[model samples]
Target: KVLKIRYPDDGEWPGAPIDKDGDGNPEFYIEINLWNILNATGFAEMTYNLTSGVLHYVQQLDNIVLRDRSNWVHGYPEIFYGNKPWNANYATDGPIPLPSKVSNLTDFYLTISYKLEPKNGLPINFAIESWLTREAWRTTGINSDEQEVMIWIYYDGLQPAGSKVKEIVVPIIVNGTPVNATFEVWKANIGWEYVAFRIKTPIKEGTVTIPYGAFISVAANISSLPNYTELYLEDVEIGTEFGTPSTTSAHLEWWITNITLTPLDRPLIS
Candidate 1:
């Protein structure tokens, strides 16, 4: 049978303004059920083992960010037929490496803008964080040259039952020009720190219930660089220090937003 994703019943999850009590906690959570592919396509039947459990998507986890999987030292999940399309190139040095004590990798502008509406009513600006550094790390669970990459959206974290992240928009551009780019969520944990829950799956395909006032964190791989170089996402002319990824253009802007969820017959595997 094809992989299927079973949406939970309404009221089973909390309502909008997800953050209700004012204590900075979500009122309810969304849940989805998933099953291993018994024997589909041309692959053989595989049993869900201890490693599989580590790779399984969790709604929300508190210890670390979404992809950080330092706990599972010996096991990690695989996506697709064992090879993923998300791996592209590691961070590239456009002009210069982003300057910072933050090692080869540095800070970034993570502007998070959100607004909730009353069905058809006007939307209100809830919160916005313009600059957010991509401080997480990703390790390819398997040994491979290079591959494409994706990021899973689990508000609380990536684990058994975690809060879901939705209704946000993320715009990416190479240099200052907006280019045609794609974002996806996949499964697979590289190294022992970060794992990709959205791997092998489209961004819209995976999700869980997340109430308001919920704190969210995300982790992704940065191993796909043309020369294993490092890059930065920030204002072009904001020169600070060494190790800064050089830029040929100025002015940069993008948005990461969560949209509505839909129902599907498949498990929405990564």
Candidate 2:
């Protein structure tokens, strides 16, 4: 039996799909995209105890100089389906290769178990990011994609990309109890439009379940992003977005236990 973890070693792809437990199927993909870091220096360390089933992927940020734009997320280990958009210079390949058209799906639910700690109190945003694009084979970092919709679970000091567009109440089941949760939506466009739904109160730890359609309904109304009927669900990613903080060496230390994806034959919410 064998298990392994890979990085952007040969630079063939932005990240590599992790087939944990030595299973033929990949459970998730780790993204080590440093596109925004025009010039920087740092490294990441990871180890897996085959006997104990522990994955230790440690990220250490030393000296770093980011790009000039209202820059973006460095990287994340995410579970995605279908095509992952990337620049033409770079490439991408994941476990799942079929695109899920948003309008055609009855329900898309994601359950994630995550934990993290910002050692230096760095500005970080932990989110479930889904790239809603106009085409099936879209390229990234060039605005060829239509929109980036993110649901922020926990954040500090860092704000979602763009200005506050609206506040929406989304119905969700918490511990099987129906609750109306409020999320503030922020929008910005640096070629591609980015809409983020920030949770009013952060969920610090444990597993969390999220509904995809509820947030998509909010993004579709903005009139700039791809229309509801035109968008295709590409990559479903959950990760912590962090960069060089006030402290010299900084980044979020985190762990993801499980990410469960389910497709319902019927609607979970209207």
Candidate 3:
């Protein structure tokens, strides 16, 4: 059975463009139901700014079980999948390959413009993530273990989820401009290694560049994953993750004005 995405009811989800002041550009959200996946009050949503071409997301979870498991998340246009979504009960099936057209491992870049605002001094936990799953995931969820790499663009007043690895510096370049950034690693739940790239000063808004090929190698080195080069490229995710000590109605106003993932080498139009 092909994986299917179940949308929320209209009453629970307002699936319409939000336009205030009669502005042509509307702000709306893309929603999907995930109560079965997380076994909690979990759902995936992407709020987009039509005027600025920004995509914002906020994960409102309640009493979610903290376990390490491989799963699927829907409702983001920027994602590519090798296998179509099927009715596998949200199980970790195959390390489904991400479509090559979406992102090529060698020559490409993933860019995002965002802002992080949280109420009650809540530390922001959001990042750009990519996964490398096993082949068995295509059919079903047996032997469903995978590797995940995350680049935290905005993490303040809170620590990354998992066991901490020492702070180290990684050199990165964006838009042909060079930058040196400090990064920290943590052994996240379910044998997944998480990497957080520190934001030294508080930033209200900014663009983050991830050279697909370069950053992959950097993540490989940091995680000491010798087989990183051979791993199949899966999906690309950009969103936020919420944890404890957050208010009951605690909300974080996060926004992404623009997001682009394009190949580095392209043919000239004749």
Candidate 4:
């Protein structure tokens, strides 16, 4: 596989993997691609080992300057595995048709399992980001800014984009674990809005299940914005966001497994 970037120019990089045991291929292996300069900036790539259902990341951007003179030069490189019938992977083959909208669904739930280890002591922000775009913007492209809802699994140093407008504490149970969530509303410079439901106590690693309708209820409460039920579910993404920390390298590895999504009204998996 080739990991290449262009400022319309070629950049140097490397790749690797692992496999062991009597069989030629071990239960799983990880492949990574590194780049010295991409779009005139430093960048790296990582992947999850599907054979074992684990997520991992390896990156090195220490002493590298991440800035943009005219455009977003730095990039967040990651992968995602989504529910069946959802083909929102824009990385390959451009953008495909959005399979379904949030309003049309009777029920929805997403369950994720993962472990997090930040290697460089800096608290990197990793999250499950879901973009809610209005159908008017999705097809017409009239408005570029779109609504966003995020589930912050782990983040301590820096927060999500935009400016905080409100904060609240709420009691909730994810999966079987009780957790206090810190909810925040933010307004972006582009005129779009965002709502983030972040766990109060940081969870380094574990499984958490989220009911989609619960978050929609929160978004719907925003009086200034359109009804959450009216917006289309544009995309679903899982990854980390980070930059160099004061000349020190920032790193984090996340391992995820047994991710599933199902209709809430349906029978539980046996």
| Candidate that scores best on TM-score | 2
| CA deviation > 4 Å runs, candidate 4 | 1-43, 69-77, 81-99, 136-145, 167-175, 180-182, 226-230, 244-248, 266-270
Give candidate 3 misplaced runs (Cα > 4 Å).
1-45, 49-52, 57-104, 136-145, 172-178, 189-202, 222-227, 245-247, 265-270
The TM-score values for the models, in the order shown, are 0.19, 0.80, 0.60, 0.66
Cα RMSD of all models vs. native, in order, equals 21.4, 4.1, 9.0, 7.8
The CA lDDT of each predicted structure is 0.21, 0.63, 0.46, 0.49
By the TM-score metric, which is better: model 1 or model 2?
A: 2
Q: How many pairs collide in each candidate, listed in order?
A: 71, 0, 14, 2
Q: Please, what are the lDDT tens digits per residue for candidate 2 over residues 103-210?
A: 665666777776767767776777887776667666644354478888988787677878998889877655455668888999988578788999887766667777
lDDT tens digits, residue span 1-270, model 1: 112112122222111212224454332111221111111111111111222221122121112211222332111112111111123112212222322112333233322222111111111111111111232222222223222222332111123112233333333332244433332322333321221222221222222222111111222223332322221121111000100012111111112122222222322111
Candidate 1 lands at a TM-score of 0.19
lDDT of 3 by residue, 194-239 (tens): 5445445434567767565555555556664444444555545566
Q: Name the better of 3 and 4 by TM-score.
A: 4
* Best prediction by lDDT: 2
* TM-score for candidate 2: 0.80
